[PDB]
Design a protein around this ligand. Structure first.
Ligand SMILES: CC[C@H](C)CCC(=O)Nc1ccc(S(N)(=O)=O)cc1
Ligand SMILES: [Zn+2]
Length: 257
């Protein structure tokens, strides 16, 4: 099965998922000088006041904080998007070292980690239908750098001990994802894909320019998670990122000058 090791990592994925070599794969390097300001882009609208988190799950590749997406409760709209996208889950990708971990890069710079807030287009009814459409998902990407702690992340950090291994979940209600956002909603946007198998080409990526800062102790706790299940040999969940993929026939647009 696919993963992030030498024998099953990103360079292998194309054998089971040929779309890995497709025309709109993610992540990509964001060349800031080549991205073009698009004055017709609208401000993002991030409406998370009614978000209902439910659970946190270690799925063997990352941990997902899952939300109730059976009503319009936490939605993303505006920006490059037409229509309304509902928050279903967020997760991160991170490194074994502070100098790597992000999936997107900015002028080839790697951040310590990257948060993905995953949303699906309500016109398709459910997430499984949405991933089969070119405009099915909108993923809000936010870079993490190591410095000061992010207080709004701490409730996530502190539950990780309870979901150390693959397949473990824990109740995780009343978590407010607004505490994970930077001040500015300036962003870059481009059409892309899921960054893990099945690598479906269904995502409008919206990547915030401003990173959030997290403490070294916060990211160290991410790195204590396990890829393996309980009672299997311990493999630390680190370096669960896909490297930048060719941009091909795409233009990255900026919301800002
Ligand atoms: C049918 C599709 C898939 C098996 C269903 C499970 C799923 O949601 N996968 C997923 C979600 C988000 C990302 S990312 N890293 O934000 O692009 C990567 C993978
Ligand atoms: Zn992701």
């Amino acid at each position: 099965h696919w993963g992030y090791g030498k024998h099953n990592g990103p360079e292998h994925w194309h054998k089971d998922f040929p779309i890995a070599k497709g025309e709109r794969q993610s992540p990509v390097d964001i060349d800031t000088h080549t991205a073009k300001y698009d004055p017709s882009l609208k401000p993002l609208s991030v409406s998370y006041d009614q978000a209902t988190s439910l659970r946190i799950l270690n799925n063997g590749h990352a941990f997902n904080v899952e939300f109730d997406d059976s009503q319009d409760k936490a939605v993303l709209k505006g920006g490059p998007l037409d229509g309304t996208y509902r928050l279903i889950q967020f997760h991160f990708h991170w490194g074994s070292l502070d100098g790597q971990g992000s999936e997107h890069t900015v002028d080839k710079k790697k951040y310590a980690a990257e948060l993905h807030l995953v949303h699906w287009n309500t016109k398709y009814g459910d997430f499984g239908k949405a991933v089969q459409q070119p405009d099915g998902l909108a993923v809000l990407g936010i870079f993490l750098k190591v410095g000061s702690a992010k207080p709004g992340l701490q409730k996530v950090v502190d539950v990780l001990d309870s979901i150390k291994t693959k397949g473990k979940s824990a109740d995780f209600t009343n978590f407010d994802p607004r505490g994970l956002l930077p001040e500015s909603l300036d962003y870059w946007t481009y059409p892309g894909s899921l960054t893990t198998p099945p690598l479906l080409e269904c995502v409008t990526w919206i990547v915030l320019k401003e990173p959030i800062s997290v403490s070294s102790e916060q990211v160290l706790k991410f790195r204590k998670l396990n890829f393996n299940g309980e009672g299997e040999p311990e493999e630390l969940m680190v370096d669960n990122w896909r490297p930048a993929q060719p941009l091909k026939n795409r233009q990255i647009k900026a919301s800002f000058k």
